[PDB]
Design a protein around this ligand. Structure first.
Ligand SMILES: CCCCCCCCCCCCCCCC(=O)O
Ligand SMILES: CCCCCCCCCCCCCCCC(=O)O
Ligand SMILES: [Fe+2]
Ligand SMILES: [Fe+2]
Ligand SMILES: [Fe+2]
Ligand SMILES: [Fe+2]
Ligand SMILES: [Mn+2]
Ligand SMILES: [Mn+2]
Lengths: 273, 285
């Protein structure tokens, strides 16, 4: 039951950081994936050699699955914060969710346009990928229906924001750029990736805000945060090694260092105080 | 529980799904930002009213602010349930639904802030009937879906929120606010807000009808449930309406300072009109 309503008893906290992030999201979040011209992307893909055609697909499969996952899986988080009365958080998360829907849509549209929509790209998810996306992610998010303790929220934000978006996805945008914009290939996908990377700058900020406000109440949670990151590293780098083994069949030595860099950078964005 | 796989890895989005088409319309037609509305004439208009004129609109604003905030919290279980059923295109659409409702909450709260009543607690205009729908039945029917996503649970949730709250009360609210404050040349920024809001809600009702009718096509037993759930809520619908009516009648200072004939019997029949129209948008097959 609702006890009352903040915009009836009072107003929105206009000075809340997440309400300000909400405002930014409405201003900077107007792109529509339906407007992306994929026609050159189709030609590029067709002109590729089958050996080149596959080289693209592992990454797209990682992302298509990853965006769809978070679209389905943020909803428990939004619900738990709604139940705690954090209205400005909820306002922000509606932009988060619609961003992610556009992300799902964009990769799906590219798949469709280059002609691989009928292809099942699950074959490029290895065990380590499945551990993160098929298992740990939904596990940590769905927990929050029955357990919204600080430890549960921090574990979900760490998994979704610091590992999935902040290590794997950040590293993936960089990989796409380091490979295809140099080549002059796939300009519509790279356009989408650029819009998406803008969106994701906001998403990481909600995650930092969330993890940090909890850490602030008890620095015991800081060590929780680090432990959770390290728990998932073996699957992060297991996936990366799987993908680097594939491409060698571009210095994957560099992209495997960018992943390592991102992971440590994300750890540093949270302070013990 | 874990994901089996992902539709946009095995396949693609179902581009011909009607909820995808509705998602596409939502993106194209849902660009308005309440932060852009000019409330300066509203703040002056509100200040130009007496204490007694000043309140005639607040009961409506309190019903609206509470209603928009409730659904912002209470749609989330519905989106989760459909996500669990693999209804990806529904979920995509629902991201626009939820973001719309966020803007609706924001708009009324901006208006309250700008006209100067942010500090005033407007809960006093929620009578027991209002509470039974918005403080109780709405969240009960939605939160159910976390543990019971059966067709009958989904019908009930869509009926409460989409057919009653949006399609009866909110549709009547927009009419009332037009029949009164557009005729009074009052609160232009609020009515611009309400215009945009009402456009949003045309899509929301289409999702609710799609959802209810989808379930009724599986089995007609469910048509009767829809009618019964509509009927179980009518008394609170009309209980709130009578209450809002008796308020307006005894604070009639704004009606005659602005030479308006506010017909609280016409407004009452429009509510009844919306209720039955909503029944007619669901067919037994
Ligand atoms: C060979 C170098 C490795 C490059 C790393 C690529 C990893 C693929 C990206 C998958 C994660 C995408 C998750 C979406 C996050 C979000 O939607 O916020
Ligand atoms: C005297 C005339 C009575 C008219 C009825 C007025 C009722 C106020 C409506 C408040 C509910 C608003 C819910 C909005 C639903 C949505 O945002 O989708
Ligand atoms: Fe994201
Ligand atoms: Fe391994
Ligand atoms: Fe709505
Ligand atoms: Fe009563
Ligand atoms: Mn994303
Ligand atoms: Mn609304």
């Amino acid at each position: 039951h609702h006890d009352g309503f903040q915009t009836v008893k009072a107003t929105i906290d206009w000075e809340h950081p997440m309400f300000k992030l909400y405002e930014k999201a409405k201003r900077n979040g107007k792109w529509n994936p339906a407007d992306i011209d994929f026609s050159q992307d189709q030609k590029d893909f067709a002109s590729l050699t089958s050996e080149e055609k596959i080289s693209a697909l592992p990454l797209v499969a990682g992302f298509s699955a990853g965006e769809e996952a978070i679209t389905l899986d943020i909803l428990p988080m939004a619900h738990a914060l709604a139940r705690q009365g954090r209205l400005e958080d909820v306002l922000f998360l509606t932009t988060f969710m619609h961003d992610e829907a556009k992300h799902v849509e964009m990769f799906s549209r590219w798949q469709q346009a280059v002609g691989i929509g009928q292809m099942d790209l699950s074959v490029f998810h290895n065990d380590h990928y499945k551990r993160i996306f098929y298992e740990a992610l939904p596990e940590a998010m769905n927990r929050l229906y029955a357990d919204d303790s600080p430890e549960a929220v921090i574990r979900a934000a760490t998994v979704y924001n610091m590992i999935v978006e902040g290590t794997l996805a950040e590293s993936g945008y960089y990989t796409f750029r380091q490979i295809y914009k140099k080549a002059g290939l796939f300009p519509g996908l790279l356009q989408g990736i650029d819009y998406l990377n803008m969106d994701e700058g906001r998403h990481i900020q909600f995650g930092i805000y969330t993890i940090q406000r909890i850490v602030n109440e008890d620095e015991r949670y800081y060590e929780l945060f680090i432990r959770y990151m390290d728990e998932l590293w073996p699957h992060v780098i297991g996936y990366v090694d799987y993908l680097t083994e594939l491409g060698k069949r571009i210095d994957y030595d560099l992209l495997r260092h960018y992943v390592i860099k991102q992971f440590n950078l994300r750890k540093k964005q949270i302070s013990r105080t």
